[PDB]
């Protein structure tokens, strides 16, 4: 048919929906299987570690994905730091398990290099995206605050929904933190989650389970736009793991080759080709599609496919407050501290967004008590459970990392999954850029502790993954240090587009999936023009 889309994630399904609604014929190819939510929920209830957010999504042998309890070793992580990030390989993809935080980038984020000298600018500026952000916000179903809180991204319409009330936890802390220093600027977090019945989905009931699933789909999952794109007339073939894009005599793509769960090779021809396979499996189809007129791997005449790969290095603190706060009432995250999202310093350091957890801590605090190996009367035990799971506060952040071409993903010459497809070999390091911010990030934590009567203060100074797989096919000016034009079309192949965070020259200071949806809608507009 007319358009072939690889990846039933959010990025792929938004495109597939837009173009299938315009009556044009579409084929959506998914590596992994179609699994419903009642199944994920059941696998969730039955799993022993309820902090493992990858654990209720089976790593299919034909379309594996990273697991870490225990490690399934699917990724080869060489370098100086583990790129141990998570992603799902099933219909609807990784927005099955996200916290549904739906931020826009700020104006500097697009002109990092010009403004700060570091990093590397985008072709497009904030204001080309803004109208596209707004439709993203409507399409996902984003709640966020009105004009009483500046988020620093210039709005034209207001947020489709208002926030629900903060938890006593998140509100008390927002008040105390902003009262110690209003520079911190704790705000209500914009989120793809319902404060009222919306686009057919129900209102949020406070399941506290946002990652790794909603039982009710009160928050947005990519599966929403799959079931949409399907009703528009797109053809869903799941268990179709694409390993090759074939080039033709005009420097254009002409088919995508894909294997089934058997490893039996199949072919699908189309007029246009969108690649939405997360910021790893996407380069991994590019470098693996090398051939006659395209030696160095499809769309990669810049040497840039798989390079300048980024995520937000994470750093945290934990403590028991002096005041009972009761995390785990309402959504898992409702509140973020954005005081450092921007400023002068971003030429020396990484910016961050810090965020308070509102996650239920009964399991963690009950386990902790039993490790003290002291038998107590049922009444002390129950008292101490309620006290500890009432006062626990935890903070976490996203530092920015800049697009370095050393940091990269390549298919393995050696390593192979159960059906012949080479495997991700990510190399990755964290420079003093990120580390010099994180030293300051950790002074904020030390202060926050002291404000809230902090006891048992532990700093978590190991950089944690944050699942923002961004940069791997950087968009830019011209094809001699870039893979894609400002329109997220590949400089080499005129009928190939990349719907993914792979297209993003900067990771910035916030969850990037909104921005992914911005570009996915923006692209869908462009391609609709083409016959």
């Amino acid at each position: 048919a007319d358009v072939v889309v690889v990846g039933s994630g959010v990025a792929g399904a938004i495109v597939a929906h837009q173009l299938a609604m315009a009556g044009k014929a579409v084929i959506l190819l998914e590596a992994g299987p179609r699994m419903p939510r009642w199944e994920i929920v059941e696998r969730f209830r039955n799993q022993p570690d309820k902090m493992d957010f990858m654990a209720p999504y089976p790593s299919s042998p034909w379309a594996p994905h990273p697991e870490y309890g225990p490690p399934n070793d699917y990724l080869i992580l060489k370098g100086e730091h583990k790129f141990n990030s998570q992603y799902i390989r099933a219909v609807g993809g990784t927005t099955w398990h996200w916290a549904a935080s739906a931020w826009r980038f700020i104006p500097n984020d697009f002109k990092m290099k010009s403004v700060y000298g570091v990093g590397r600018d985008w072709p497009i500026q904030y204001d080309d995206l803004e109208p596209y952000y707004q439709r993203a916000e409507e399409e996902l179903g984003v709640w966020g605050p009105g004009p009483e809180e500046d988020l620093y991204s210039p709005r034209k319409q207001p947020y489709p929904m208002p926030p629900l009330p903060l938890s006593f936890n998140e509100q008390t802390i927002k008040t105390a933190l902003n009262n110690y220093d209003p520079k911190f600027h704790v705000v209500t977090e914009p989120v793809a989650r319902n404060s009222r019945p919306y686009d057919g989905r129900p209102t949020c009931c406070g399941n506290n389970n946002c990652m790794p699933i909603c039982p009710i789909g009160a928050m947005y999952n990519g599966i929403v736009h799959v079931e949409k794109a399907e009703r528009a007339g797109a053809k869903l073939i799941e268990n179709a793991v694409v390993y090759k894009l074939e080039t033709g005599p005009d420097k254009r793509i002409v088919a995508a080759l894909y294997k089934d769960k058997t490893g039996a090779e199949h072919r699908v021809e189309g007029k246009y080709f969108v690649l939405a396979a997360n910021g790893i499996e996407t380069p991994k189809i590019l470098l693996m599609s090398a051939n006659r007129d395209f030696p160095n791997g499809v769309a990669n005449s810049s040497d840039m496919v798989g390079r300048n790969l980024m995520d937000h290095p994470g750093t945290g603190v934990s403590f028991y407050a002096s005041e009972k706060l009761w995390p785990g009432r309402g959504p898992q995250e409702m509140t973020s501290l954005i005081g450092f999202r921007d400023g002068p310093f971003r030429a020396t350091e990484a910016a961050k967004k810090i965020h308070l957890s509102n996650l239920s801590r009964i399991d963690q605090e009950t386990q902790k008590i039993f490790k003290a190996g002291k038998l107590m009367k049922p009444d002390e035990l129950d008292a101490q459970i309620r006290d500890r799971s009432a006062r626990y506060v935890q903070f976490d952040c996203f530092h920015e990392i800049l697009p370095q071409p050393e940091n990269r993903i390549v298919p393995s010459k050696t390593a192979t999954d159960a059906i012949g497809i080479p495997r991700p070999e990510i190399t990755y390091a964290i420079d003093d850029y990120v580390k010099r911010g994180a030293a300051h990030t950790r002074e904020v934590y030390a202060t926050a502790a002291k404000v809230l009567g902090g006891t048992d203060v532990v700093f978590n100074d190991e950089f944690a993954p944050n699942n923002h797989i961004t940069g791997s096919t950087i968009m830019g000016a011209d094809a001699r240090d870039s893979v894609v034009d400002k329109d997220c079309r590949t400089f080499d192949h005129p009928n190939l587009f990349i719907s993914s965070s792979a297209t993003m020259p900067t990771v910035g200071t916030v969850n990037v999936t909104l921005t992914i949806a911005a570009l996915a809608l923006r692209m869908s507009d462009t391609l609709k023009k083409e016959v």
Binding site: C205, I213, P215, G330, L375
Partner: protein, 114 residues
């Protein structure tokens, strides 16, 4: 008094809760009998010592193993029960079990009382 009878009365002492499921009690016993209660003497003995008197660090270690199984609902990294785990019951007034709604609007803006 089979192993279950003794297990279930031990559990009523150690947890203090009256009306613990025997359908779940049997499942926790069987799971624990993979790694604990290898003797047929260990359980009646623990019931005795736990009654009047004191415990050896190894008897108190077993008591804890039993409490731990009712509270967390997991033995040897296997969920025996999720919904009927006792720790959830201790804070039921304020906190939900993740993936089960309260039948109310939730209303989380209030400060919990006691």
């Amino acid at each position: 008094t089979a192993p279950l009878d003794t297990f279930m009365t031990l559990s009523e002492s150690l947890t203090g809760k009256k009306g613990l499921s025997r359908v779940i009690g049997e499942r926790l016993l069987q799971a624990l009998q993979k790694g604990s209660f290898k003797t047929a003497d260990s359980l009646p003995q623990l019931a005795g010592a736990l009654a009047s008197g004191s415990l050896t660090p190894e008897q108190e270690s077993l008591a804890l193993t039993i409490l731990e199984a009712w509270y967390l609902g997991i033995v040897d990294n296997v969920v025996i029960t999720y919904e009927e785990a006792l720790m959830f019951g201790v804070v039921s007034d304020t906190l939900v079990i993740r993936s089960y709604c309260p039948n109310k609007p939730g209303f989380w803006a209030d400060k919990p009382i006691e």
